[PDB]
DNA sequence: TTAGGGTTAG
């Protein structure tokens, strides 16, 4: 739930699937050991940074132009 | 509005006395009902009567509009609504009475 | 005390 910086995280590039069928793909790993800065803090959410994700997914939520979710409009009842 | 001031006097000898009597009650105008009151907790639910009376889900999505739409879209199209009755309009014309708190 | 900045092979 909380909010982090993967300090040097690594990327690396995925071609196949578990049968090995092409299928690329974007692997993400952190290397043991803290040289180079590999490493891992817990922002806090006071921090102007966590300011600027959030005023980014305001725009990727009411603005998603994103197709539908939820077909099961009986769930919600807002404030039940 | 409906019987304004000015009249002449209701003078009694001349009530009595007249051969030709005329008075308060020798003719006379029909009346249908002006102004009638309602309290307001009527007037809420005849509101709130004819609303869910007229809703009609055909005639808010009319074709050839219709027949397209996705499922999701075709119920938020649907699920808001307004309507604007105007009772000074009934028969009787509703006035309005109350307290502002 | 340790560590005392610099790329894993996952």
Redesign the interface.
């Known amino acids: 739930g909380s909010f982090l910086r993967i300090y040097s995280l690594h990327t690396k590039l995925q071609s196949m699937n578990s049968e090995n069928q092409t299928m690329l793909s974007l692997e993400f790993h952190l290397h043991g050991g803290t040289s180079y800065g590999r490493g891992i803090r817990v922002l806090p959410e006071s921090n102007s940074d966590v300011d600027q994700l959030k005023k980014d997914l305001e725009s990727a939520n009411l603005t998603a132009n994103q197709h ?1 979710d939820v ?1 099961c ?1 009986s769930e919600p009842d807002d404030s039940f | 509005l409906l019987a304004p001031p000015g009249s002449p006097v209701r003078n009694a000898h001349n009530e009595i006395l007249e051969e030709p009597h005329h008075c308060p009650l020798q003719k006379y105008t029909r009346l249908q009902t002006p102004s009638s009151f309602p309290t307001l907790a009527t007037l809420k639910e005849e509101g709130q009567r004819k609303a869910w009376a007229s809703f009609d889900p055909k005639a808010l999505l009319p074709l050839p509009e219709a027949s397209y739409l ?3 879209q075709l ?1 938020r199209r649907l699920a808001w609504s307004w309507l604007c009755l105007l009772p000074s309009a009934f028969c009787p014309a509703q006035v309005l009475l109350g307290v502002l708190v």
Do not use: E, V
Request: charged share 0%; glycine share 0%; proline share 14%.
């Open positions: 539908s077909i409009q | 996705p499922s999701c119920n």
